[PDB]
mmCIF file of N, CA, C and O in Angstrom:
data_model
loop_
_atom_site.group_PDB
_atom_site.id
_atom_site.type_symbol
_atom_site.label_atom_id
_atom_site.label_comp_id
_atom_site.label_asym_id
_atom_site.label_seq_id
_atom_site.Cartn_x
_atom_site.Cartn_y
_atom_site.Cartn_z
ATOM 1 N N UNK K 1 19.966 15.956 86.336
ATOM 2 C CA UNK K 1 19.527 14.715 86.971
ATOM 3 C C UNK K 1 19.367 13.591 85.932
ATOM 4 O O UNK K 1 19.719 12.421 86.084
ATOM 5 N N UNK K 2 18.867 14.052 85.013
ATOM 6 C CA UNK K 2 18.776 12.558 83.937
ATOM 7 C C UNK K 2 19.754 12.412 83.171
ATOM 8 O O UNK K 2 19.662 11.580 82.269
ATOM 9 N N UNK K 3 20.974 13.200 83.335
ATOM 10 C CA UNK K 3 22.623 12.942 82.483
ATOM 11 C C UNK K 3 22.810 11.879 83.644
ATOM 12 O O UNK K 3 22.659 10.700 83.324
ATOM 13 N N UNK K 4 23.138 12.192 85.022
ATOM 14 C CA UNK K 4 23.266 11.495 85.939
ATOM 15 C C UNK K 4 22.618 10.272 86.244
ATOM 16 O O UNK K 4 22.929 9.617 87.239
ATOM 17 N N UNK K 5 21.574 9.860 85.300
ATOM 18 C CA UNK K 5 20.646 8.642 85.552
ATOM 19 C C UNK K 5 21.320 7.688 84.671
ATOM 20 O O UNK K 5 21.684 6.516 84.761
ATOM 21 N N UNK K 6 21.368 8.886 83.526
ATOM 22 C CA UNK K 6 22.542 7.922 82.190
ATOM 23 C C UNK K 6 24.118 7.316 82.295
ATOM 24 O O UNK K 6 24.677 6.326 81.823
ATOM 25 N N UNK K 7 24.586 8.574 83.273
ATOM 26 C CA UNK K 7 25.984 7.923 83.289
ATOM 27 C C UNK K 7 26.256 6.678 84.553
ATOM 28 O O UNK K 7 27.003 5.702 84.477
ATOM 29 N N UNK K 8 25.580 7.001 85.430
ATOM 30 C CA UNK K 8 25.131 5.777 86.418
ATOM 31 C C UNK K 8 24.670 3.982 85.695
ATOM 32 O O UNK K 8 24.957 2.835 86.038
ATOM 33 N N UNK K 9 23.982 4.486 84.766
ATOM 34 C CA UNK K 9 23.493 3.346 84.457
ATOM 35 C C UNK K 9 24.587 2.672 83.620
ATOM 36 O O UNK K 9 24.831 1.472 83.742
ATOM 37 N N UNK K 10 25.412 3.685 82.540
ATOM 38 C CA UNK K 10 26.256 3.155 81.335
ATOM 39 C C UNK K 10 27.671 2.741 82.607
ATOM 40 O O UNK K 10 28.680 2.175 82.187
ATOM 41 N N UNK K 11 27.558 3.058 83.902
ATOM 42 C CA UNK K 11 28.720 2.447 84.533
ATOM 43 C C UNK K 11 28.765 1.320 85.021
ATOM 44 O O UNK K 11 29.754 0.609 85.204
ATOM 45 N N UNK K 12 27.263 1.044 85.336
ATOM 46 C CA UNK K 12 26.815 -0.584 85.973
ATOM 47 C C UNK K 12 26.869 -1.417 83.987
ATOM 48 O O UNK K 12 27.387 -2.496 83.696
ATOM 49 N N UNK K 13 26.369 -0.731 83.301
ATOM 50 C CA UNK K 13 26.531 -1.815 81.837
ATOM 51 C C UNK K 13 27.929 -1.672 81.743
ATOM 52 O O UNK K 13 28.050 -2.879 81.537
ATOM 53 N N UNK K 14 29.150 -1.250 81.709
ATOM 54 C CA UNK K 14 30.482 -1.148 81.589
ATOM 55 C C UNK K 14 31.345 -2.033 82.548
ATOM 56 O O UNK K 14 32.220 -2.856 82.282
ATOM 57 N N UNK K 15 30.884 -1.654 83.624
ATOM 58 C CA UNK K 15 31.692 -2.497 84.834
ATOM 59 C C UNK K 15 30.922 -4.570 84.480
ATOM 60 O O UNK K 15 31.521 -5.594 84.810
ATOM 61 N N UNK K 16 29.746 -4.516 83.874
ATOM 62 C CA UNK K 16 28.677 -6.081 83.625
ATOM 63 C C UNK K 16 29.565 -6.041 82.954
ATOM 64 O O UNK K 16 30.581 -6.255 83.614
ATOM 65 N N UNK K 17 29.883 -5.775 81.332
ATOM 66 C CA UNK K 17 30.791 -6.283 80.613
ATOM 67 C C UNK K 17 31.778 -6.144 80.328
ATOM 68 O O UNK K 17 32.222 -6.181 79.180
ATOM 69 N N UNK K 18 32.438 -5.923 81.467
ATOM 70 C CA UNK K 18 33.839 -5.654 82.041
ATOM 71 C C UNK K 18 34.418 -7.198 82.345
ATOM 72 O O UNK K 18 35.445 -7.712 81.901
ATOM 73 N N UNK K 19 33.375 -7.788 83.288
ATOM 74 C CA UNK K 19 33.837 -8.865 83.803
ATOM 75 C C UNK K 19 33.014 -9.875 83.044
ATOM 76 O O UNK K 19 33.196 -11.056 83.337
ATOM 77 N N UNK K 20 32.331 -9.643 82.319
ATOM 78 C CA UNK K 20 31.795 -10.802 81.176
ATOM 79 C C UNK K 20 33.098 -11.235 80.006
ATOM 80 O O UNK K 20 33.543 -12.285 79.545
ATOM 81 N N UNK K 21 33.474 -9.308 79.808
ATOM 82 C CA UNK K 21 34.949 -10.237 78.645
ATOM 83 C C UNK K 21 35.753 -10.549 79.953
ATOM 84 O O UNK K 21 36.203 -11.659 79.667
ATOM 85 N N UNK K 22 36.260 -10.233 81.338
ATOM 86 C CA UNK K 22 37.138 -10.625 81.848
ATOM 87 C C UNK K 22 36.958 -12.193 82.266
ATOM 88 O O UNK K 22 37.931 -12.926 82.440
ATOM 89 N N UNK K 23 35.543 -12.645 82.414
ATOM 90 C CA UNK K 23 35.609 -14.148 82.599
ATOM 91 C C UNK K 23 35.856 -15.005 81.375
ATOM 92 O O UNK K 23 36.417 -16.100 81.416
ATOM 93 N N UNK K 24 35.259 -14.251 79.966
ATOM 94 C CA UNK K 24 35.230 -15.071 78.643
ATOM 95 C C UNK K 24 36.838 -15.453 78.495
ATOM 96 O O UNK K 24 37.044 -16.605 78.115
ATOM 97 N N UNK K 25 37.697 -14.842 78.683
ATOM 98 C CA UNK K 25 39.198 -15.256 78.053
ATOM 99 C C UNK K 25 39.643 -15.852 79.592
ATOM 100 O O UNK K 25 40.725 -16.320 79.239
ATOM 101 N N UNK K 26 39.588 -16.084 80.678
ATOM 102 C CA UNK K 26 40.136 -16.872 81.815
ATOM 103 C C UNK K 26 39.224 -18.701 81.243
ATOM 104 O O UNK K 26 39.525 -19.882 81.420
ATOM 105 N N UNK K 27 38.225 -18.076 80.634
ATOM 106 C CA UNK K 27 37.989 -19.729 79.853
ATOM 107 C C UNK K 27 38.678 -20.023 78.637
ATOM 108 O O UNK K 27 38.089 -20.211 77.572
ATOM 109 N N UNK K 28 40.076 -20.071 78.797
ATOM 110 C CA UNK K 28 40.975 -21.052 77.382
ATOM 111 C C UNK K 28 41.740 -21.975 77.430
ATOM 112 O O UNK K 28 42.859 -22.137 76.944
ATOM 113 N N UNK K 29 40.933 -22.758 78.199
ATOM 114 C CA UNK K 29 40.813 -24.494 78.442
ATOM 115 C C UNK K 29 40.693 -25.380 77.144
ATOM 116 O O UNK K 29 41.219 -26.488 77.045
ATOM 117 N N UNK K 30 39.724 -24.592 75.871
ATOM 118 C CA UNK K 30 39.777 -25.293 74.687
ATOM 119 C C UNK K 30 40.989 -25.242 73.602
ATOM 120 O O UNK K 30 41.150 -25.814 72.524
ATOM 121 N N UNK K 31 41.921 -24.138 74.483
ATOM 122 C CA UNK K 31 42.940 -24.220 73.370
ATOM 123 C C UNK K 31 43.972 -24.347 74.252
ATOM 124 O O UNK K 31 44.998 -23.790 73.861
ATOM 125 N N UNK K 32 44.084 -25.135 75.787
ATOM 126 C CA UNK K 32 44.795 -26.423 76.011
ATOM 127 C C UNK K 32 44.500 -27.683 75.655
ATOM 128 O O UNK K 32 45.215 -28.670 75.834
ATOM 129 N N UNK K 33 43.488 -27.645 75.173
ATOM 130 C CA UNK K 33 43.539 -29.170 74.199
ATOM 131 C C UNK K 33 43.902 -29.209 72.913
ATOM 132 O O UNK K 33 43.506 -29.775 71.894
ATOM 133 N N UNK K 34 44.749 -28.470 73.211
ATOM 134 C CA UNK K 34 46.012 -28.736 71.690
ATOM 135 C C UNK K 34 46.704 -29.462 71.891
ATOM 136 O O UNK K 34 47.138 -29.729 73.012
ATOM 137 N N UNK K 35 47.098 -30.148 70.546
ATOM 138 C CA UNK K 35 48.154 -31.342 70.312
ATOM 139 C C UNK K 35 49.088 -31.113 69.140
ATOM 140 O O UNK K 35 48.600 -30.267 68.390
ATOM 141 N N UNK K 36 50.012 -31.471 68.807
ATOM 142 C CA UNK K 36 51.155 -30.971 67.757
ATOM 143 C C UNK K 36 50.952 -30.193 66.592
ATOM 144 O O UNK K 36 51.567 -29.272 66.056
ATOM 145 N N UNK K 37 49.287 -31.206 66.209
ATOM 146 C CA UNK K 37 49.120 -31.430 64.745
ATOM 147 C C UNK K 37 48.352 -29.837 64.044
ATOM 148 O O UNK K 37 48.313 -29.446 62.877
ATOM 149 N N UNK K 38 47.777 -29.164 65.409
ATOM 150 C CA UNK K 38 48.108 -27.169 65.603
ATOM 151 C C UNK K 38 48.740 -26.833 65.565
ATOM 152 O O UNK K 38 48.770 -25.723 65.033
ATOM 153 N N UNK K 39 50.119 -27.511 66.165
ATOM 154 C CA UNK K 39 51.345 -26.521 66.241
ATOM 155 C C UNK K 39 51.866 -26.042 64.937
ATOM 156 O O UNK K 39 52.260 -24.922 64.612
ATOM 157 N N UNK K 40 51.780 -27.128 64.277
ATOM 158 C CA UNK K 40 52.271 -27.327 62.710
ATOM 159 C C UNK K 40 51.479 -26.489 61.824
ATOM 160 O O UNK K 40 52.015 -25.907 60.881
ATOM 161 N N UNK K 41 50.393 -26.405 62.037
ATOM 162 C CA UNK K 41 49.607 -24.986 61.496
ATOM 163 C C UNK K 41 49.438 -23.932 61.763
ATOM 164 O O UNK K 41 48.728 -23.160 61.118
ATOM 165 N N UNK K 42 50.304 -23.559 63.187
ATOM 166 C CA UNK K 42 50.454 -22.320 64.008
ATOM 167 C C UNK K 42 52.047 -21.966 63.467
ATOM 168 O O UNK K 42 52.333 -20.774 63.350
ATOM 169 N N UNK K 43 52.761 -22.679 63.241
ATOM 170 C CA UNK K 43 54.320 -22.369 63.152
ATOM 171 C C UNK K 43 54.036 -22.626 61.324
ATOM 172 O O UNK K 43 55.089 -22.874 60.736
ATOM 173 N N UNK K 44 53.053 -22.599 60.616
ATOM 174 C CA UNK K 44 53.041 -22.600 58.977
ATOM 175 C C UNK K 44 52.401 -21.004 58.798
ATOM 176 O O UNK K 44 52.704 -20.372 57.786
ATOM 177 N N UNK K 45 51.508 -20.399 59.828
ATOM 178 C CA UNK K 45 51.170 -19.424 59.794
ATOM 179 C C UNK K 45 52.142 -18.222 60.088
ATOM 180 O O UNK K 45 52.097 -17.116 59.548
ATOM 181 N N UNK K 46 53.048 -18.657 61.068
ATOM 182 C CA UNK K 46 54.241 -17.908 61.561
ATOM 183 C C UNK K 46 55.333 -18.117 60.380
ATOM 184 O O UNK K 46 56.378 -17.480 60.514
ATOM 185 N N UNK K 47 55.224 -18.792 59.447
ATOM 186 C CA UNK K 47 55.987 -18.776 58.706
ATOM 187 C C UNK K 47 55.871 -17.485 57.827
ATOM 188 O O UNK K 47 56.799 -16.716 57.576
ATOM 189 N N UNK K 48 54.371 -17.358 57.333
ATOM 190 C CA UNK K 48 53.379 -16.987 56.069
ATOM 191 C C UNK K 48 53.493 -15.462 56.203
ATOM 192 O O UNK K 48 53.517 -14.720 55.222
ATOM 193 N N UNK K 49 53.564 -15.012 57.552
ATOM 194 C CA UNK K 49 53.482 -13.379 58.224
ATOM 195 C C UNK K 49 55.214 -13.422 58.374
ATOM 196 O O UNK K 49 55.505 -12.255 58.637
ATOM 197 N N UNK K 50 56.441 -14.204 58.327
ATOM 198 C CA UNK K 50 57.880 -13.746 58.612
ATOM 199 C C UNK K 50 57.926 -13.595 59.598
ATOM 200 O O UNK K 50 58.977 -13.217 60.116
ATOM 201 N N UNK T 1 9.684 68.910 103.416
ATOM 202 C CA UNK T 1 10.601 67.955 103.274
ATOM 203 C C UNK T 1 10.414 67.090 103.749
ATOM 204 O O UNK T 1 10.757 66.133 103.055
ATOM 205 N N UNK T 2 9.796 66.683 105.152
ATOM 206 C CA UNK T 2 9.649 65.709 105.458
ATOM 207 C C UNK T 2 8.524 64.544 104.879
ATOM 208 O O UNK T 2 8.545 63.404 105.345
ATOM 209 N N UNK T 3 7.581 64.928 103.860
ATOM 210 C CA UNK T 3 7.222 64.009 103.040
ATOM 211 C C UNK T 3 7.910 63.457 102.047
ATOM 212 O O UNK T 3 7.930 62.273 101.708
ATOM 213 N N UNK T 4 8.675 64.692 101.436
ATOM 214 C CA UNK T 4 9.608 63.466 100.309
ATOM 215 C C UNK T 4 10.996 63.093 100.818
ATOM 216 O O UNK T 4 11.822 62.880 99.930
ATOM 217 N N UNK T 5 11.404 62.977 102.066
ATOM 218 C CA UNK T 5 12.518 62.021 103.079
ATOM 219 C C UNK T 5 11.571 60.639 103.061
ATOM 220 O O UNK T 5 11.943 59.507 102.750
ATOM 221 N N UNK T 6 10.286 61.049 103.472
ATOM 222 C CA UNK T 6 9.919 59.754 103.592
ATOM 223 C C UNK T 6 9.456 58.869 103.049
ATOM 224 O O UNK T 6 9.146 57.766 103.499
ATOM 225 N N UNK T 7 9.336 59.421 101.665
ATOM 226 C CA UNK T 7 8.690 58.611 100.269
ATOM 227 C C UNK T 7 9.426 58.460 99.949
ATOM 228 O O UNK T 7 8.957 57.660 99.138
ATOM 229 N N UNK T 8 11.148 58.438 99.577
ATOM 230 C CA UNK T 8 12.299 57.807 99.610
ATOM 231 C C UNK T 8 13.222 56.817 100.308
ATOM 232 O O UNK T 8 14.145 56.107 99.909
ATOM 233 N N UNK T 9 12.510 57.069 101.770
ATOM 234 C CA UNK T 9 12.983 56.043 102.509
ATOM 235 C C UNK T 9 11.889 54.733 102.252
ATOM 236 O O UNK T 9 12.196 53.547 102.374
ATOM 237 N N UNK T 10 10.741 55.182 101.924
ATOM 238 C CA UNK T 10 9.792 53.872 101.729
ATOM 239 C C UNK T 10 9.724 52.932 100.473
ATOM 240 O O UNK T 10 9.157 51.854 100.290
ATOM 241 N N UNK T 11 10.677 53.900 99.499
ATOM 242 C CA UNK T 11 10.515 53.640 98.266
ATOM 243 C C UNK T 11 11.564 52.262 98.185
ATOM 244 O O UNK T 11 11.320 51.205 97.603
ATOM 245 N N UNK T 12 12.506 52.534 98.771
ATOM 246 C CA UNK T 12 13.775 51.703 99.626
ATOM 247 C C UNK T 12 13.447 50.609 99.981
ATOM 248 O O UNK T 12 13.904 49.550 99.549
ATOM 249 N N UNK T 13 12.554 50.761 100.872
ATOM 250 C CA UNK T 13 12.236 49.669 101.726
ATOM 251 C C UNK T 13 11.373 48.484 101.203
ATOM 252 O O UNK T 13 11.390 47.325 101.618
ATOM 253 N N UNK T 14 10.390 49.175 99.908
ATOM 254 C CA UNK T 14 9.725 48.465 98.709
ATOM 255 C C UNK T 14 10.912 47.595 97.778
ATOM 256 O O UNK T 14 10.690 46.386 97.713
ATOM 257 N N UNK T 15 11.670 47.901 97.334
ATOM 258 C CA UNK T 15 12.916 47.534 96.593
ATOM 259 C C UNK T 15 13.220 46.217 97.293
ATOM 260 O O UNK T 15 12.840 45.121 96.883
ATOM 261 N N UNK T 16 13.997 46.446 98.474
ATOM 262 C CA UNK T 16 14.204 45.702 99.152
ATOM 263 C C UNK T 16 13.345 44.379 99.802
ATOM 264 O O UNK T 16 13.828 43.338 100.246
ATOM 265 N N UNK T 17 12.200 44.691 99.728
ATOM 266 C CA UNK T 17 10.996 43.649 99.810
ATOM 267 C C UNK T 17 10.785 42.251 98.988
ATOM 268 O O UNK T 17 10.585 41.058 99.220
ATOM 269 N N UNK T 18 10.981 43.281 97.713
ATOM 270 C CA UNK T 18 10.997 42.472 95.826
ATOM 271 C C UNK T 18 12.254 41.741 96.215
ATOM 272 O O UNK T 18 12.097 40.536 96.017
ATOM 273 N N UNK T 19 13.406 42.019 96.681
ATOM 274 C CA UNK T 19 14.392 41.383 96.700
ATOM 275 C C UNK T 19 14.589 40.341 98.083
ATOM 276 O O UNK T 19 15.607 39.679 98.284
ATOM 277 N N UNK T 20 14.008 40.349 98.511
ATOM 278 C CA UNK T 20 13.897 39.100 99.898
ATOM 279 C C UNK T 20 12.663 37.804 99.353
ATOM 280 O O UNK T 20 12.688 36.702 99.900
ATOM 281 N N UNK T 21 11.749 38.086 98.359
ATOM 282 C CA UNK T 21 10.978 37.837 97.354
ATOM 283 C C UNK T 21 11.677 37.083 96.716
ATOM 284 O O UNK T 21 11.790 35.887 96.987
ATOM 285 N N UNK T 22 12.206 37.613 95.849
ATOM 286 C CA UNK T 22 13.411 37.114 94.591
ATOM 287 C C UNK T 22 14.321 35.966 95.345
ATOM 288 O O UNK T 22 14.433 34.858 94.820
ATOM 289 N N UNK T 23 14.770 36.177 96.215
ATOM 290 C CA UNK T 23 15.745 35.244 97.076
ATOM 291 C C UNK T 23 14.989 33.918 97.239
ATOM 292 O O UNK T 23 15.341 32.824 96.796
ATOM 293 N N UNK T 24 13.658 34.263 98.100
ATOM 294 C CA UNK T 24 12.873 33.330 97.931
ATOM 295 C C UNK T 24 12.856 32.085 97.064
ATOM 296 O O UNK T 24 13.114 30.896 97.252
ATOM 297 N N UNK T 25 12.397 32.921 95.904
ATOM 298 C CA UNK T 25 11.836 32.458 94.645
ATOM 299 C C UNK T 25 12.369 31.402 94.326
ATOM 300 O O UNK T 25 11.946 30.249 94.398
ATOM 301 N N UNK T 26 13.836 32.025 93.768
ATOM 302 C CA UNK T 26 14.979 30.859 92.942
ATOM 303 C C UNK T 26 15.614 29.945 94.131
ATOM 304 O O UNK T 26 16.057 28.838 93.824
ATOM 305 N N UNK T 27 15.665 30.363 95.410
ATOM 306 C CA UNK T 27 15.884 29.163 96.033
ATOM 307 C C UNK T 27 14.981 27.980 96.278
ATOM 308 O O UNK T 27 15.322 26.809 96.113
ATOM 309 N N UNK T 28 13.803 28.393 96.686
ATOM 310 C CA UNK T 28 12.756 27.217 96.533
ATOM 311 C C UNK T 28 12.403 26.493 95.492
ATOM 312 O O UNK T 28 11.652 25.517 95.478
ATOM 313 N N UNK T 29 13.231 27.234 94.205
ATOM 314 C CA UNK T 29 12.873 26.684 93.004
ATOM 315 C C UNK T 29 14.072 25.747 92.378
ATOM 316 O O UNK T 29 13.753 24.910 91.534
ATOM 317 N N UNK T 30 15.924 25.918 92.919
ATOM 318 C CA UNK T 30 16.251 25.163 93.123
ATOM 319 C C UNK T 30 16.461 24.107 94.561
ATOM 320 O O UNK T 30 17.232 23.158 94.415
ATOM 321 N N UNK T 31 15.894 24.257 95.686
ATOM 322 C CA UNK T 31 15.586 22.854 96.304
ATOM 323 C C UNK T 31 14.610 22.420 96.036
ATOM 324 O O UNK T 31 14.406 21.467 96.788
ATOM 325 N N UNK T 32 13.773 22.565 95.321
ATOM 326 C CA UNK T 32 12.950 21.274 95.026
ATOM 327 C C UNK T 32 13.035 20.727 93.625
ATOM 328 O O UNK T 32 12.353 19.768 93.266
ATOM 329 N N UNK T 33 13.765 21.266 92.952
ATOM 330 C CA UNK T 33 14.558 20.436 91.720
ATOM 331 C C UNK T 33 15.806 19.800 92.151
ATOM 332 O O UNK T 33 16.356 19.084 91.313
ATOM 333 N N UNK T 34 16.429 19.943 93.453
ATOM 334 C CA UNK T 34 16.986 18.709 94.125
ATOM 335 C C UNK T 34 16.861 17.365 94.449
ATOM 336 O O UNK T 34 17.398 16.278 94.232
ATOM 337 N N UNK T 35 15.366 18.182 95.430
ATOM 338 C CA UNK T 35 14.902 16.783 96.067
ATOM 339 C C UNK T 35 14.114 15.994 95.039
ATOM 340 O O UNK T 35 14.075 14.767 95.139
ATOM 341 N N UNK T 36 13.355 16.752 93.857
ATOM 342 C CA UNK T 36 13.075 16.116 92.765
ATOM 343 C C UNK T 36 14.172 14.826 92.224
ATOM 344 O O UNK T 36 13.914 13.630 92.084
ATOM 345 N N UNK T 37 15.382 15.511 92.001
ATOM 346 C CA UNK T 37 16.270 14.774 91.775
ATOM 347 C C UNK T 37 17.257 13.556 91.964
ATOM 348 O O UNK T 37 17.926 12.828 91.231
ATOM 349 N N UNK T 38 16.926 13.749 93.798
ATOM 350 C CA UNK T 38 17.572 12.897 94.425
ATOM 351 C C UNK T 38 16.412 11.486 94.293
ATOM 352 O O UNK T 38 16.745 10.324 94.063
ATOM 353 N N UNK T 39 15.131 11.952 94.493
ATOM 354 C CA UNK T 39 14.113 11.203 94.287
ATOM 355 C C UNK T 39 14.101 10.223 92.854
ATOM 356 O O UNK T 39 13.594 9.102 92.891
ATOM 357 N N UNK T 40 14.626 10.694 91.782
ATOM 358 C CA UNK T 40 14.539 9.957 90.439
ATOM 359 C C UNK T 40 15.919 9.206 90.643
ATOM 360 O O UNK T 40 16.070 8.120 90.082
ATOM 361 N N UNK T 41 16.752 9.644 91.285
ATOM 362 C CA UNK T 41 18.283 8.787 91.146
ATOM 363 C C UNK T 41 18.357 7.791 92.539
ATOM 364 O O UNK T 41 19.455 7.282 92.766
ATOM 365 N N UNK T 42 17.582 7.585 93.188
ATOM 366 C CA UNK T 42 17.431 6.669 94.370
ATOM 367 C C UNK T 42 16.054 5.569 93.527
ATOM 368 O O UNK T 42 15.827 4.361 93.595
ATOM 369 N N UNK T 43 15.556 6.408 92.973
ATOM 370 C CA UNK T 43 14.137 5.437 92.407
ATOM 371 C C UNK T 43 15.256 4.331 91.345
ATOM 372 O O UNK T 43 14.769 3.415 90.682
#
């Protein structure tokens, strides 16, 4: 009975931050406010790795 | 003979007593570590 209290509970904390990271990354609105002057440091980084 | 037929048949019937006992026992002892249980996982 108290394994069963534990795994009950670690499924309600699993499934909470399940959809805490699943809402955190549906918010990347701040990296549509990119403008070129990233790109140029995103495609210098893509250079740096080949 | 007919005293020790029948102190064998009673002896039997003692055995069998302990064991309707025993049945008892461990079943009442797991349902109420059930309902114990169901009680802590509904709480």
């Amino acid at each position: 009975a108290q394994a069963e209290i534990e795994q009950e509970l670690n499924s309600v904390k699993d499934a909470l931050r399940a959809q805490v990271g699943a809402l955190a990354v549906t918010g990347a609105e701040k990296i549509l406010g990119a403008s070129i002057d990233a790109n140029a440091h995103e495609q210098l980084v893509s250079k740096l790795a080949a | 003979g007919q005293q020790l037929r029948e102190a064998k048949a009673q002896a039997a019937e003692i055995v069998e007593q302990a064991k309707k006992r025993a049945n008892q026992i461990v079943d009442e002892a797991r349902d109420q570590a059930r309902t114990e249980g169901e009680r802590l996982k509904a709480q």
